[PDB]
């Protein structure tokens, strides 16, 4: 299974001098526009807010994208005017990631291509995955923890044993805080195998819990659940634990096997 080469934190700050594409009164009066941006990294897509009637938009939004050692992967950005029909094009940008890794931290205005005018203000942070916990304390403080992610949670769903029944069709749902993802379904078995990998962004591992619920997908019935304070990982080697876990609201011998690893996101120079 692929593992991330790092995390790219994208500050979608502002743009200036964009192309006005709206016109009042049958096109007599030249007007401004309603800019917003579409940001792409690999399969990950991000959409900024629409700011109305302004060619120097200030979004101050921030997105977090996973980056792997895959070929030539790039940061793609397109700006549009929100119109009631087809949104008019306000310019585009293409940044080489392998270049961004090299610089670690950028703060620059970029001139949009394929438009007569327009500039975009970005601050890019290349965060690497740290296996030791040595810098968590510093990363939490820089974020100003009192939000964006201070860590990643990478977890492996191996299998479960001896689940309650008649037989069920087991599926697992994991949700660190509000982010939630689901495994695939196994059918008519009390011994499911998934061998699936999942990744979650983490604001603060000292506060957040991983919640795991096993369900029978056919029927509303629950098959057990599990809470794992991520803090417990903080005291494990390479912030990774691998064991069988007891399920609650389940059988007495019902368990779930996982590998769970934490990585602190760090900007170095």
- Residue from 4, 8, 11, 34 touching Ca ion (CB under 5 A): that is 34
What the block records as the tokens of 38 is 């579409």
Between the alpha carbon of residue 223 and those of residues 6, 177, 220, the distances in Å are 35, 21, 10
For 150: left if phi > 0, alpha if psi spans -120 to 50, otherwise beta; the answer is: alpha
Nearer to Ca ion, 87 or 216 (CB): 87
3-state secondary structure of 36: strand
Do 6 and 124 meet the contact criterion of CB atoms below 8 Å apart?
A: no
Question: Which residue has the closest beta carbon to Ca ion?
Answer: 21
What the block records as the tokens of 50 is 């629409």
- Residue from 17, 53, 83, 107 touching Ca ion (CB under 5 A): that is 83
- Residue from 5, 9, 11, 21 touching Ca ion (CB under 5 A): that is 21
88 among the known binding-site residues?
A: yes
179 among the known binding-site residues?
A: no
**H-helix segments, 50-163:** 97-103, 136-143
Q: Is 53 in the site for Ca ion (CB under 5 A)?
A: no
Nearer to Ca ion, 69 or 83 (CB): 83
- Residue from 81, 125, 213, 216 touching Ca ion (CB under 5 A): that is 81
What the block records as the tokens of 92 is 């585009």
User: Nearest approach, Cβ of 82 to Ca ion (angstroms)?
Assistant: 5
82 among the known binding-site residues?
A: yes
Q: Are strands 119-130 and 255-266 parallel, antiparallel or unpaired?
A: antiparallel
User: Nearest approach, Cβ of 83 to Ca ion (angstroms)?
Assistant: 4
What the block records as the tokens of 36 is 């917003």
User: Nearest approach, Cβ of 117 to Ca ion (angstroms)?
Assistant: 16
As a whole number of angstroms, the distance between CA 134 and CA 264 comes to: 9
Stretch that binds Ca ion, among 3-11, 26-34, 58-66, 241-249 (CB under 5 A): 26-34
Residues belonging to the binding site are 21-22, 34, 81-83, 85, 87-88
Which residues form the interface with Ca ion (CB under 5 A)? 21-22, 33-34, 81, 83, 87-88
């Amino acid at each position: 299974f692929p593992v991330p080469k790092g995390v790219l934190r994208i500050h979608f700050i502002e743009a200036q001098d964009l192309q006005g594409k709206d016109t009042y009164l049958k096109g007599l009066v030249k007007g401004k526009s309603d800019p917003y941006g579409i940001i792409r990294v690999g399969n990950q897509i991000f959409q900024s807010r629409v700011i109305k009637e302004n060619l120097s938009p200030k979004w101050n939004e921030v997105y977090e994208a996973l980056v792997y050692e895959h070929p030539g992967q790039e940061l793609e950005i397109e700006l549009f005017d929100e119109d009631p029909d087809k949104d008019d094009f306000l310019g585009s940008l293409m940044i080489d990631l392998i270049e961004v890794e090299k610089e670690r931290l950028l703060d620059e205005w970029f001139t949009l291509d394929e438009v007569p005018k327009g500039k975009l203000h970005l601050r890019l942070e290349w965060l690497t995955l740290m296996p030791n916990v040595s810098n968590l304390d510093k990363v939490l403080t820089d974020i100003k923890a009192d939000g964006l992610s201070s860590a990643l949670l990478i977890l492996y769903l191996d299998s479960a044993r001896n689940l309650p029944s008649s037989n069920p069709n087991p599926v697992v749902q994991m949700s660190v805080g509000h982010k939630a993802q689901e495994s695939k379904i196994r059918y008519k078995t009390n011994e499911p195998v998934w061998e699936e990998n999942f990744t979650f962004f983490i604001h603060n591992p000292k506060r957040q819990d991983l919640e795991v619920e096993v369900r029978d997908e056919q029927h509303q019935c629950s098959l057990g659940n599990l809470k794992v304070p991520l803090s417990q990982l903080l005291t494990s080697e390479d912030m990774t634990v691998s064991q069988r876990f007891q399920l609650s609201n389940s059988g007495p011998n019902s368990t779930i096997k996982m590998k769970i690893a934490l990585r602190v996101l760090h900007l170095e120079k």
